[PDB]
Amino acid sequence: KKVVLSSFSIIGDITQNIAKDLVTVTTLVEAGNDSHSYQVTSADAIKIQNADLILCNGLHLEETYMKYFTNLKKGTKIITVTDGINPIGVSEDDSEPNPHAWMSLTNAMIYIENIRKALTALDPSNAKKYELNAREYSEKIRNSILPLKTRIEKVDPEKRWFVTSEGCLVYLAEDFGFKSLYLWPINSRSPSMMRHAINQMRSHKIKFIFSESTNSDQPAKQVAYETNASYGGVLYVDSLSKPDGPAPTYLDLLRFSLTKIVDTLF
Ligand SMILES: [Mn+2]
Secondary structure: OOEEEEEEHHHHHHHHHHHOOOOEEEEEEOOOOOOOOOOOOHHHHHHHHHOOEEEEOOOOOOOOOHHHOOOOOOOOEEEEOOOOOOOOEOOOOOOOEOOOOOOOHHHHHHHHHHHHHHHHHHOHHHHHHHHHHHHHHHHHHHHHHHHHHHHHOOOOHHHOEEEOOEOOOHHHHHHHOOEEEOOEOOOOOOHHHHHHHHHHHHHOOOOEEEEEOOOOOHHHHHHHHHHOOEEEEEEOOOOOOOOOOOOOOHHHHHHHHHHHHHHHHO
């Protein structure tokens, strides 16, 4: 049986829905661990050796541990599952890419397609099954998420703002036609970014700011105070939750976080 290693929990869950036990799906950065700065263990090195295929996000998500994907099994390729997604930069223009492409309905379909394609090239005799599974999963995502988009798109143009702590929603904003504000591009944080957000929230009368499941809520709450806005609560973006949490799957993560956003806009 072939072994397919996903770089983190979001990609692992997507792959599991497409492969459905036709391959063994493993995960490097397990749910709860930090996708942005991970220490690859010895046990992890065994997962890397066993991999017949390695599925990465790209957009520099894995940059600090790409070095561990070496001395690989003969023939094992590293696939970047964000291929075909136009990068959004971390700056305010040339700059480093924002990695959070999976927070998008459109991009969900592209992650699924790239993974379907890589599974099919790895294991061509199950092409018909990956093809079916990918369509079914794609429809499942669309059926859960599209009603949230539809609700979201009723928002008045001057209220089209996603304001968060990490810049985790820049692809969602682009996908749905919103503008995004945040306090730092990627979790790992500076004064002028905070000052800019405070000034922008006031000028545009923004009502809510979120934090996220793997970072502190303190900067968001402080910003809420200084802007006369409200703290919106915690979104799930960087990792699946634990199994009895609210976002144990990619579908659940999108649905939870987008539900929470829409319930704030109205
Ligand atoms: Mn992040």
